[model samples]
Target: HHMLQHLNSGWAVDQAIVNEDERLVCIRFGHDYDPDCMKMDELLYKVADDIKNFCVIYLVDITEVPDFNTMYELYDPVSVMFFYRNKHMMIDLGTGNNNKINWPMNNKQEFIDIVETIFRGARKGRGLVISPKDY
Candidate 1:
């Protein structure tokens, strides 16, 4: 697998050789301008379309890179949080009482390390999966 950083705004595809036997295709879309009128569901659907075939999509909210409170608020709606050990495996940290999950990392390197960990072998713990029962 390959790691791409600082993707520009637009649609692009990256190809990688998984092994001698398989290949992986990664499609990315970077929109510098956030749509002001779109609702949450609409934005989510747009993002979903980009990674439709991926088994799992890990979302990292680095928008709060300079503010902890902002980060907390950004994660306020998340139902689960995961922490990674080494640079290639991850472990769930369980959900917070207020529906927030805090990750133990301060910089981008640390964040990427945890990401790599999760990418390697992460185990699920307490996570909220919305279902019909909740509705």
Candidate 2:
């Protein structure tokens, strides 16, 4: 549930790291580490240490950071979003949803492919990447 650091507030969540170029910042917006979050949390936790060179994953809860529910259009269930250079990252989910991921994936391999595709593409100067499968 707490595989990643829980950013305390909007002031603490932004600036510096998120603003710099390089590694991808994945922010998980949800109620807690259970439910839909449990699935993605473990996947991310397993690779958190492995992917540190290029990606940094963080978790944020609604009860604690409700000030920005409308900030990124987040939810209590589970919604994972990506950012690079402090810019919001969107994915072509193939289902017409060009925002963050709103569903659980099949397994780790699938998520890795996604991270690599977008992370690499993002650092390489591309603005968009295709997800392996649509949600």
Candidate 3:
């Protein structure tokens, strides 16, 4: 199943986070009506098949999944965070923040490279990894 699924409940999101032991757990925290989020997800769906074996992608609306609001402090319009083996995976996107990616990526190759880089790094037990290219 390469299609991106929506995690509607906080408990479902929690289960989704801790259940993945091998593949990278990627959560797109934003609403469906968001233009930026819509654009980002188009790119996400395109790359899903390419990385399905090593990564799993999910969508979580901040309002719908309110449990993480206080816990993660999500202030951006749209955000994509990575997790592996129940641990948060941080990235240095050369954007000063290592917490998550709040911007949308247009380049399919660039996004794929970044995800692959994080996967390799996380598999090695790293909590944070640098993006393959600077944003």
Candidate 4:
């Protein structure tokens, strides 16, 4: 968890979501010590370097930055939302909600593949992309 950069302020979160122009912005919203979040961070940290070329990952503690709690419907222990060039990117992962990934994904390669797919679609100015696999 210490290996990942964390955003504590609502302003910081907004900037992260809106400011990245060349890379995909992935923000994981949850408490750092939460088990689901820790598990998710493990895979994220492992694939961070591999996906650095097209994606930038961020950790946002829901307690500290409650600004988007209701806005994004962050009721799960951990949720990941993606943004590209100021556009909110959506992914249909076979989940009822296409807004974000609300479950912890333990596989590194799978996470990387999802990021790869999102990057490709977002680059073409597409807001919604189907995940490589349905979870």
Each model's lDDT comes to: 0.27, 0.74, 0.87, 0.88
Q: Which stretches of candidate 1 lie over 4 Å from their true place?
A: 1-106, 122-135
Q: What is the lDDT of residue 98 in candidate 1?
A: 24
Q: List clash counts for every candidate, in order.
A: 3, 0, 0, 0
Which scores better on lDDT, 3 or 4? 4
Higher lDDT: candidate 2 or 3?
3
What's the C-alpha lDDT at position 61 in model 2?
A: 81
Winning model by lDDT = 4
Screening candidate 2 with a backbone cut-off below 3 angstroms (N, C-alpha, C), the clashing residue pairs are none
User: Which tens-of-lDDT digit does each residue in 18-72 have in candidate 1?
Assistant: 2212111211121212332122223333443443333222232233222222432
Model 4, residue pairs in steric clash: none
lDDT over C-alpha atoms for residue 74 of model 1 = 41
Candidate 3 has a TM-score of: 0.95
Q: Model 4 residue 10 lDDT?
A: 90
Give candidates' CA RMSD values in order. Answer: 14.7, 3.7, 3.1, 3.4
- Estimate, for each residue in 1-135, the C-alpha lDDT of model 4 and write its tens digit: 007789989999888877777999999998778999889888888999999999999999998889988888888889988889878889999976888888889888888999999999999989899999987
Error of 3 at 42 (Å): 0.8
lDDT of 2: 0.74
- List candidate 2 stretches off by more than 4 Å: 1-3, 16-19
What would you estimate as the lDDT of candidate 4? 0.88
Clashes of 2: 0
